Amino acid sequence: AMSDTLYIKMDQAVEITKKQVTVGDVAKLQCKNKNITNRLKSMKLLEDTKRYIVSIMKIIEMADQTFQNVDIQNIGETECVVEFKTP
C-alpha cells in the first residue's frame, strides 16, 4: 500500500499573457510519481475571456478529485492573485 506525496508551492501573484492559466502557471510541483505532477501541471484552473484569485483549497480539491492515493503537503501560499496581461 503506497501513498504518493505531492508537494505544492503556490506563488503569491502571477502575471499571465495566455488564454488559459493552469495549475503549473500558478505553482511549482514535486512528486516522486511523475504521473501525478504531469497530469496536475496541465489542469485548467481558469480561462481569460482582469485578475482572479486562486485558493490552494481549489488545487487540493482538484487533486483529490483526480487522483487515487495522493496526499498533499502545502509548502507555499494559500492564496494567489493571477492577473491577465494583453490589455
Encode the chain in three state secondary structure. Answer: CCCEEEEEEECCEEEECCCEEEHHHCEEEEECCHHHHHHHHCCEEEECCCEEEEEHHHHHHHHHHHCCCEEEEECCCCEEEEEECCC
Tell me the CATH class for 1-87.
mainly beta
Experimental method: X-ray
The phi and psi torsions of 60 (rounded to 5 degrees) equal -65, -45
Residue spans of the domains in the chain: they are 1-87
Q: What is the largest CA-CA distance in the chain?
A: 50
Resolution (Å units): 2.4
Alpha-carbon distance of 9 to 26, in angstroms, equals 9
